[PDB]
Symmetry: C2
Subunit: 159 residues, 2 copies
Amino acid sequence: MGSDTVIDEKINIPVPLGTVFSLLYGDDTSYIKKIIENQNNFNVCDIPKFVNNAREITYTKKQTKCIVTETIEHMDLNSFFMVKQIVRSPDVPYGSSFSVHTRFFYSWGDHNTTNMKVVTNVVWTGKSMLKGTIEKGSIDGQRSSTKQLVDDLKKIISN
Amino acid sequence: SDTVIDEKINIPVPLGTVFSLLYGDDTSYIKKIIENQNNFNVCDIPKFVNNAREITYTKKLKQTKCIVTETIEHMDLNSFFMVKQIVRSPDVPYGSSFSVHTRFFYSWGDHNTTNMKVVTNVVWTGKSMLKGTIEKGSIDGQRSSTKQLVDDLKKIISN
């Protein structure tokens, strides 16, 4: 529980990265609108064009409302792009306390195709004081280590 | 949720140099980096095998044992590579119930340099039936939605 599931890492779409990007994330949102409707969703709202590498999509699942954010995390149509999707269900039990995170890896595949990997986990929020104390120590310690790592890394390369 | 530890870091050498220093088969650099962060009893660092390695050390406070799993989640030294670090501390209070997951995003920086971003989630685990039911339905649902996404993508392309 809480760990990642590799939903699938043996996906290949037989067209280049830029085509898969255009279909799923491009300026013509008709393709992704239908795809969403084919997954037993309806009343999909007008798909915003990407702005600041993000867009928010609302629809109804078969019944409950879903709010989905998609964030482009890396964008190299010659080699690799990566999108993180976060799906919220505000009206289900504890829906304000969890979301479903899915990262989509799109990487150059043999013969100019697109390899796809899909990884998901469920992220719980909700601020238990005990959890909150442990998290603050964990994040403060990682901030300290990361600053030391970057400092040492730069000293290593400078000689 | 996803706490950005650091951001907009630039290391003025190429992606491959950063990779080699932190993750290459000469593990002496990363051993020294770890030892420089108030850590001792650092094992001789294994090289990555099958995109994973395990690192054990004890940390100053008195002292507590850390078991770190690093996994290479993508590696393209011409564009982007990403390593997930999971730090477990089974000897601290609640250490069997949480772990610290940090993702290190390395991307091609201007003029053949390395840009670096670091994001942490504290993951809580622990046999909750309530959360376990939501966890399974979520992963089942994304598994269903992803298979439909891929099928629809191949139909769009083959038409």
